[PDB]
Design a binder for these strands. Structure first.
Ligand SMILES: C[C@H](CCC(=O)NCCC[N+](C)(C)C[C@H](O)CS(=O)(=O)O)[C@H]1CC[C@H]2[C@@H]3[C@H](O)C[C@@H]4C[C@H](O)CC[C@]4(C)[C@H]3C[C@H](O)[C@]12C
Ligand SMILES: [Zn+2]
Ligand SMILES: [Zn+2]
Lengths: 227, 700, 146, 153, 196, 50, 110
RNA sequence: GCCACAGAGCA
DNA sequence: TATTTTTTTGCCTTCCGAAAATTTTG
DNA sequence: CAAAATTTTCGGAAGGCATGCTCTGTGGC
């Protein structure tokens, strides 16, 4: 807040420091429902769901074997299955992998085969290093999510990230009451009048936190001139 | 302490060390001039002196400083050098050869005002209360301000969280050569970059060009037994396989294929790579044989620090830490300037000699000294302008500093006293908060907590404390032999696998070896320091996080005396104090008996200092001599400053230098460009000990 | 101040043992810092409130604070009673040295007097570590103004 | 014997236990037959016992060597003064006390003794004779451990 | 504080020129027992450059890869270790005879590390055969360059490797050391006065 | 608003020093205590608070 | 894979070769390790931290129901604890959680 | 006189 | 002539191969 | 259908920019 906030509002800053999306939950009086909804928006890396990742070489075949934990999935209540992790691994474009290579062994094992003078070993090591950093669930731009219990006792899910549309499209979140302090995100999702309201509200909040007592008509003029 | 070490005498000590000792080192760096025309010709400098002929019994006559002030002259003493040169068919040596004039600093050992009584000062029209420490150039009195720099010959690790990259930089500084080397992280990979090398070299290749030829040894040096460090560093081992570099010669080829260094002699690419590894990658570490163990270990521990920084960002080095910073005084800066001036003089002299010897008629060597004078003034002016203009532009070292020297302020006695002991910060464009402008807790007792101006220079320029000492360089080879005799394993006979299983020893930032018992080694070294077998300014401190013991010997370190506490009792008793007050037992002999000792910031880190004698617990290691040392000379004028607010103390540190009052005892014999004097000055009722120690009550 | 110090020491030894429960959005270090700051702010406010109600009428700082001409209740509470916690960059005093703020405190010390609590009033005079911490806060204010 | 030709796997310890395992590793790198001040005293006593045992176990066994690290300037001995390379004959003693500690007395000065760094690599002592007729390099044995003799202060 | 037993410490062998090798690759202990010593075939030593080169024949029956060696490395079957002898002061190699500790000064310590001269030979042969198909006063070297040049120009000295000679060395060291007995000069404080 | 109690202590110390005839000390973390100067002022017939 | 050659302590790389079978080959010295019939694997055990059971404690003092657990082949328990929860939009049915009292294996129906 | 440099004043 | 250091930090758009993706031919 | 031309995306380098006024002194062509 303060002068840096005014600076990053009055210019069309694509990336701001600490953006917050304040989702209003449909079930606002249940810790279990709130944390289940958090499990839908908070990103969960493959490192958080897998017991181990290993490189296995055989007589003529080489593959990455990943063994995941269904117990942690059930304890955190992620609506996630094995094929979800398979398609999430396939969708990773930086990994350079395809659905023809990913195979399911048992109920917990995922095998990623690598096929071909020494490129097989380099690709194998690169894939092993980059695999436990893929996102199998959650939004790709959300850093973290916290359930906040307000003074009224109702619970709001406030997150750090840039996916307003994906948060307000997520089940369990009322999309008609979800707001963001970032203004170009609101402009991209909702339109130009919502961006104007976001400018006015954010500038007014920044001024009122320091108690400077600026008349809101000047803020409205600035918001209209910007948009 | 202020009778011997003082608060102004850092400038005096630095200038005395430069004139008496450092000039000989600069001469020995560049002693030989050889003509390309004639192989037999050589001219060598074997000794250098300032203001004193070897034949003369006494110092030569110099104009008094007041006469130089009035006549707009320069207060200087001639530079005499002993030159042995080949003439004709025989070598002839000439003493007392004048090659310039060094502008001497007032009240140094080369000055007329040295250890002179008040009657002599009245005869020479100089005030006895003048602090000294300035140069009279063209009548203007100029002061070389102290400079903050990052610590030389040390590894500084920094990280950019918003950019994701980390880097360990070393600023190698030696009288032979100066350079800067970086070990950076890009794309999860570790590279080594230098100004001479055109492109970044992978760390496995540069480690293979040194004595190491196996990847397991590289991993054991960089990582050791930690699985996380191995997982982070295993990427760089594959680059030696990808580029098909597997021998020392191949790595030297790869390094020397992309070096931008241009040399007089044509060099083989393998030889060029050897030269780049030996004398360009790390300048302060040089090799004279086929062994590359010290260079390899230095680069390996740089990479280890980078890996530790990548594992967690909290293992980076604080750039604002006072222990990570060194103070350049007048002596070091004049040495660095005179190195460039003497190199230019030698090059011009060699060019003139080569020009004359191209003529075949001059069979005789024509007494080549007869041609010094046309170039000799090129030194003198090159000194004077560099103090007069204040611009320090040295293209050899890529230095473009501006504002080193300042005109000596004569608005008050305290203004002149306080402009000396000002420290100029390195980064003068930093507009961010909690950077160089923040008051670090590390400067407690080292730098003033209240003396800083308000405005665009707030927090950058700062002042020294009352009781501080700035270290001068000491010899490291006796300390190296003392390390070897005390039980430190040599670096050339230890395992690379078990290097990190025991504490390492670092002499001036260079890994000298490994020690089995670090605490006993530290205790024995401290005992030798307190007894007097080594210099009192050698700093020993053990860092458990790095698993190292560090021995600092070089200059530029800020120090502070403290009373030693052993077994929960202060080592200074009442008998010592009454002997000190009686007249004997001066501060040097407190140092010799081991009652007090000098601690720098890094040694203060491994210490537990008690402010008062009533607060001593038996875990204490040191006792404060006196607390108000944490306030400087100007901040000492403030009465009861601990009952005030800090901004008011800062504002009055600013406004004390603008007070109109008496200037000096010869203020009516002086002709200055602007002088404000008070008709009826009075000393304050509410004094301070600092006022009495700096003699502010004599000239209020 | 003794009650606050004893409670802070209880939380410190609880954190050192490892059974200190965390805040909903914070880890152990952050919740310890938040709780210690809360107790120190509470004792500051309580000592100030005891101080202000005790000053007699025709007290010049009290009159000037009541008028609003110059000063406030906080400045009077600082001059007559505890100065309070020094806040640097939103936190307490950072560790300038290794795992501690000053060499005059033990290693890994998180006691209130070792991290920027000025117990003394401006009338009673500040101790050298409190002097340094107050200087840090004032220097930060001047740097921001500049 | 072919097991030595298996691929070498480096020793790996987790970061949380890298400081605790060192006590086990230092003992495991040798053949099996103030808090810091107390820990170093205990380690010094253990090293003294190990040095005494190793000195006893290498009595008259051929091809056995052990490296002393002595001060580079030994105390002066008057000529039959003497250089640091010219010392010959008996120069001192290694003395064992009842507590188990060992002390090396050279001339008139007493020095402490330690086990030094632990080496995992192989060391062998080579005698070199450079002659025009026949130059021979001879193997005398291998080095079993190091001990360091340090002046006490 | 009283001493229960003392062991005499003697110094001998001022002309032995004793060297100590350090195999950076060969481990000392395998499992729990000392490892078998490698078999040394050839030894080379440049005197003034102190470059030690030791050839060890590696097993060809198991894990050899005949094809690559016979194709691009001229069928190499020996691994060579190269090192440089560093003058280390204060090092003595000791043995025990009748519970008496005999010391012999160690001249240099060599860090023998793997050398791949066949790779360099193949590379320089390839460069020559690719450059000769279609091509397209000066002794100012000082320091490391001069050392490298004089090491490259230097002719290696072939040494006759031998084993089982510890008996004669022990006999001459004990014979030289046992006769003489030296008595002390310096005081305890005088040693702490200079180079403790 | 500026909280310069040191100025007040300086005034009292100067008053007591002039009346007693000795220059006073305002050294940091010490100096002349306020109680002694108040006692001097009381003994000289002035108010203890200046 | 992090393995080093025993002959020279240099990094071992896996080569396909002419035969098409992978070998641990060393590119410095003539050394190979065949792996036919031998499975070489390097395991990176990822750190597992403690997670709170987000549904735990919600089956205490609640009504029971007669619903067969999905693992009918292993057991035939019928009585199971059940409760309701809203984790979706208000216009779609409230979801139902069930825990078998004999075999565990908690499941959500709809 | 032109040009940079250096310091200083007020929030 | 040719050894050879940095001395603020953050943000922003335009350009431009390189690479990924998609369309388009044969 | 797979080669091949075409379009879009995605990084890294390159310039541009960063409080107001005011007052002295010194140095160099
Ligand atoms: C920096 C960041 C990637 C980080 C790696 C990228 C990835 C997601 C990106 C935002 C989304 O696209 C939504 C939106 C589109 C508008 O057009 C411009 C603004 C918005 C807010 C974007 C800004 C920015 O471009 C983001 C945050
Ligand atoms: Zn190999
Ligand atoms: Zn069931």
């Amino acid at each position: 807040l303060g002068v840096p906030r005014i600076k990053e509002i009055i210019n069309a800053s694509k990336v701001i420091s600490t953006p917050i999306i304040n989702a209003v939950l449909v079930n606002d009086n249940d810790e279990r429902a709130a944390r289940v909804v958090k499990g839908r928006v908070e990103k969960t890396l493959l490192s958080d769901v897998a017991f181990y990742v290993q490189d296995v070489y055989k007589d003529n075949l080489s593959f990455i074997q990943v063994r995941i934990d269904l117990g942690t999935i059930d304890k955190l209540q992620l609506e996630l299955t094995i094929e979800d992790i398979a398609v999430a691994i396939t969708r990773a474009s930086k990994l350079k992998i395809q659905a023809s290579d990913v195979n399911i062994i048992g109920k917990d094992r995922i095998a990623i085969n690598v096929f071909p003078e020494n490129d097989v070993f380099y690709r194998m090591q690169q894939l092993r290093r980059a695999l436990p950093d893929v996102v199998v669930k959650g939004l790709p731009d959300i850093s973290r999510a916290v359930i906040n219990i307000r003074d009224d006792g109702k619970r709001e899910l406030l997150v750090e990230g840039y996916g307003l549309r994906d948060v307000m499209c997520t089940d369990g979140v009322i999309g008609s009451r979800t707001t963001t302090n970032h203004v170009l995100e609101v402009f991209s999702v909702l339109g130009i009048e919502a961006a104007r309201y976001s400018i006015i509200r954010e500038i007014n909040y920044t001024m009122s936190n320091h108690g400077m007592s600026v008349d809101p008509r000047h803020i409205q003029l600035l918001g209209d001139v910007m948009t | 302490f202020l009778k011997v070490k003082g608060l102004v005498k850092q400038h005096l000590d630095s200038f005395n060390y430069f004139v008496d000792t450092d000039l000989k080192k600069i001469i020995k760096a560049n002693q030989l001039i050889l003509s390309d025309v004639d192989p037999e010709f050589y001219l060598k400098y074997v000794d250098i002196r300032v203001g004193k002929k070897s034949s003369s019994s006494t110092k030569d006559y110099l104009t008094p400083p007041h006469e130089c002030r009035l006549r707009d002259m320069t207060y200087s003493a001639p530079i005499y050098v002993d030159i042995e040169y080949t003439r004709g068919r025989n070598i002839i040596m000439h003493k007392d050869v004048e090659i310039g004039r060094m502008p001497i600093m007032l009240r140094s050992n080369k000055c007329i005002l040295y250890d002179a009584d008040e009657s002599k000062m009245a005869k020479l029209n100089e005030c006895p209360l003048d602090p000294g420490g300035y140069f009279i150039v063209n009548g203007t009195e100029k002061v070389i301000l102290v400079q903050e720099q990052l610590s030389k010959n040390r590894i500084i690790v920094e990280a950019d969280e918003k950019k994701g990259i980390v880097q360990a930089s070393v600023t190698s500084s030696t009288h032979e050569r100066k350079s800067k080397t970086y070990v950076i992280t890009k794309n999860g990979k570790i590279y080594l970059k230098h100004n001479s090398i055109a492109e970044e070299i992978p760390i496995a290749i540069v480690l293979k060009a040194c004595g190491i030829l196996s990847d397991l040894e590289i991993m054991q040096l960089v990582c050791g037994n930690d699985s996380s460090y191995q997982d982070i560093f295993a990427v760089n081992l594959e680059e030696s396989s990808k580029l098909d570099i597997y021998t020392q010669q191949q790595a030297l080829e790869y390094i020397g294929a992309k070096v931008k260094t241009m040399r007089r002699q044509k060099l083989t690419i393998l030889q060029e790579g050897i030269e780049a590894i030996a004398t360009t990658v790390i300048a302060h570490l040089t090799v004279e044989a086929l062994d590359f163990r010290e260079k390899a270990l230095y680069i390996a521990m740089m990479t280890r620090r980078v890996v530790m920084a990548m594992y967690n960002p909290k293992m980076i080095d604080d750039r604002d830490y006072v222990g990570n910073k060194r103070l350049e005084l007048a002596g070091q800066l004049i040495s660095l300037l005179f190195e460039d001036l003497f190199k230019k003089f030698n090059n011009d002299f060699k060019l003139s000699i080569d020009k004359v010897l191209k003529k075949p008629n001059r069979a005789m060597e024509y007494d080549a000294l007869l041609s010094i004078n046309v170039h000799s003034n090129n030194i003198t002016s090159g000194l004077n302008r560099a103090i007069s203009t204040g611009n320090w532009s040295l293209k050899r070292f890529k230095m473009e500093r501006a504002g080193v020297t300042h005109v000596l302020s004569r608005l008050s006695y305290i203004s002149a006293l306080g402009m000396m002991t000002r420290i100029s910060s390195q980064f003068e464009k930093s507009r961010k908060v909690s950077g160089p402008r923040a008051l670090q807790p590390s400067q407690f007792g080292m730098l003033c907590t209240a003396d800083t101006p308000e405005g665009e220079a707030c927090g950058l320029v700062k002042n020294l404390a009352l009781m501080t000492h700035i270290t001068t360089d000491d010899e490291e080879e006796p300390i190296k032999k003392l390390c070897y005799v005390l039980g430190v394993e040599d670096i050339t006979l230890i395992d690379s696998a078990s290097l990190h299983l025991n504490y390492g020893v670092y002499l001036n930032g260079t890994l000298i070896g490994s020690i089995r018992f670090p605490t006993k080694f530290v205790t024995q070294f401290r005992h030798l320091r307190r007894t007097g077998k080594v210099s009192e300014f050698i700093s020993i401190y053990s860092n458990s996080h790095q698993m190292a013991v560090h021995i600092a010997t070089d200059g530029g370190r800020i120090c502070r005396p403290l009373i030693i506490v052993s077994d929960g009792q202060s080592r200074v008793k009442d008998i010592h104090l009454r002997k000190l007050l009686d007249g004997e037992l001066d501060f040097d002999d407190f140092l010799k008996l081991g009652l007090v000792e000098y601690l720098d910031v890094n040694e203060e880190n491994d210490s537990y200092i008690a402010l008062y004698e009533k607060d001593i617990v038996p875990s204490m290691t040191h006792l404060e001599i006196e607390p108000f040392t944490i306030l400087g000379a100007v901040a000492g004028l403030i009465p009861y400053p601990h009952h005030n607010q800090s901004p008011r103390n800062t504002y009055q540190c600013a406004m004390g230098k603008q007070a109109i009052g008496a200037i000096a005892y010869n203020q009516f014999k002086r002709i200055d460009t602007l002088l404000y004097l008070m008709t009826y000055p009075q000393q304050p009722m509410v004094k301070t000990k600092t006022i009495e120690l700096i003699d502010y009550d004599k000239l209020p | 101040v003794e009650i606050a110090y004893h409670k802070c020491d209880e939380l410190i030894t609880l954190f050192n043992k490892g059974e200190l429960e965390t805040q909903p959005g914070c880890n152990e270090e952050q919740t310890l810092e938040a709780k210690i700051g809360g107790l120190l702010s509470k004792v500051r406010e309580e000592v100030g409130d005891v101080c202000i109600n005790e000053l007699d009428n025709w007290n010049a700082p009290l009159i000037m604070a009541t008028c609003g001409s110059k000063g406030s209740t906080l400045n009077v509470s600082q001059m007559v009673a505890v100065v309070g916690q020094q806040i640097i960059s939103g936190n307490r005093v950072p560790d300038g040295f290794q795992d501690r703020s000053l060499p005059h405190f033990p290693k890994n010390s998180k006691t209130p007097q070792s991290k920027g609590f000025v117990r003394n009033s401006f009338f009673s005079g500040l101790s050298p570590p409190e002097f340094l911490f107050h200087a840090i806060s004032g220097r930060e204010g001047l740097v921001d103004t500049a | 014997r072919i097991e030595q030709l298996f691929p070498v796997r480096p020793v790996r310890v987790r970061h949380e236990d890298v400081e605790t395992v060192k006590r086990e590793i230092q003992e495991a790198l040798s053949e099996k037959p103030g808090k810091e001040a107390a820990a170093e005293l205990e380690l010094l006593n253990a090293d003294h016992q190990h040095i005494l045992r190793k000195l006893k176990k290498m009595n008259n066994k051929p091809e056995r060597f052990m490296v002393f690290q002595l001060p580079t300037r030994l105390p002066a001995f008057e000529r039959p003064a003497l250089s640091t390379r010219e010392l010959a004959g008996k120069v001192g003693s290694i003395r064992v006390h009842k507590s188990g500690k060992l002390s090396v007395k050279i001339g008139n000065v007493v020095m402490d003794i330690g086990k030094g760094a632990e080496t995992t690599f192989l060391q062998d002592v080579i005698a070199l004779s450079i002659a025009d007729d026949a130059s021979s390099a001879e193997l005398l044995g291998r080095v079993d451990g190091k001990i360091v003799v340090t002046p006490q202060i | 504080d009283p001493v229960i037993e003392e062991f005499p410490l003697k110094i001998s062998g001022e002309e032995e020129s004793l060297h100590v090798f350090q195999y950076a690759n060969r481990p000392r202990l395998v499992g729990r027992k000392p490892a078998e010593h490698p078999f040394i075939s050839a030894a080379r030593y440049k005197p003034k450059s102190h470059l030690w080169e030791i050839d060890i024949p590696l097993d060809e029956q198991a894990f050899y890869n005949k094809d690559k060696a016979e194709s691009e490395w001229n069928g190499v079957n020996v691994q060579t270790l190269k090192g440089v002898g560093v003058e280390n002061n204060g090092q003595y190699a000791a043995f025990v005879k009748d519970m008496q500790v005999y010391l012999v000064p160690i001249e240099r310590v060599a860090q023998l590390k793997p050398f791949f001269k066949y790779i360099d030979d193949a590379n320089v042969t390839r460069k020559q055969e690719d450059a000769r198909r279609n091509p397209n006063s000066q002794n100012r070297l000082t320091g490391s360059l001069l050392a490298h040049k004089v090491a490259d120009e230097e002719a290696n000295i072939e040494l006759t490797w031998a084993e089982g000679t510890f008996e004669q060395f022990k006999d001459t060291i004990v014979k030289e050391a046992e006769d003489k007995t030296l008595v002390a000069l310096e005081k305890q404080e005088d040693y702490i006065d200079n180079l403790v | 608003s500026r909280m310069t109690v040191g100025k007040m202590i300086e005034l009292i110390s100067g008053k007591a020093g002039v009346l007693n005839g000795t220059l006073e000390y305002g050294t940091c973390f010490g100096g002349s205590k306020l109680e002694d100067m108040s006692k001097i002022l009381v003994d000289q017939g002035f108010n203890y608070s200046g | 894979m992090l393995s080093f050659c025993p002959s020279c302590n240099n990094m071992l790389l896996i080569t396909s070769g002419d035969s098409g079978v992978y070998t641990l080959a060393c590119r410095s010295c003539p050394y190979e390790f065949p792996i036919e019939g031998i499975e070489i694997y390097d395991r990176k055990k990822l750190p597992r931290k403690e997670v709170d059971d987000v549904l735990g404690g919600g089956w205490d003092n609640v009504d029971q129901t007669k619903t067969q657990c999905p693992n009918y082949d292993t057991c035939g328990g019928e009585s199971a604890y059940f409760f309701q929860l809203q984790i979706r939009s208000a216009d779609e049915p409230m979801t139902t959680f069930y825990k078998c009292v004999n075999c565990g294996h908690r499941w959500k129906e709809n």
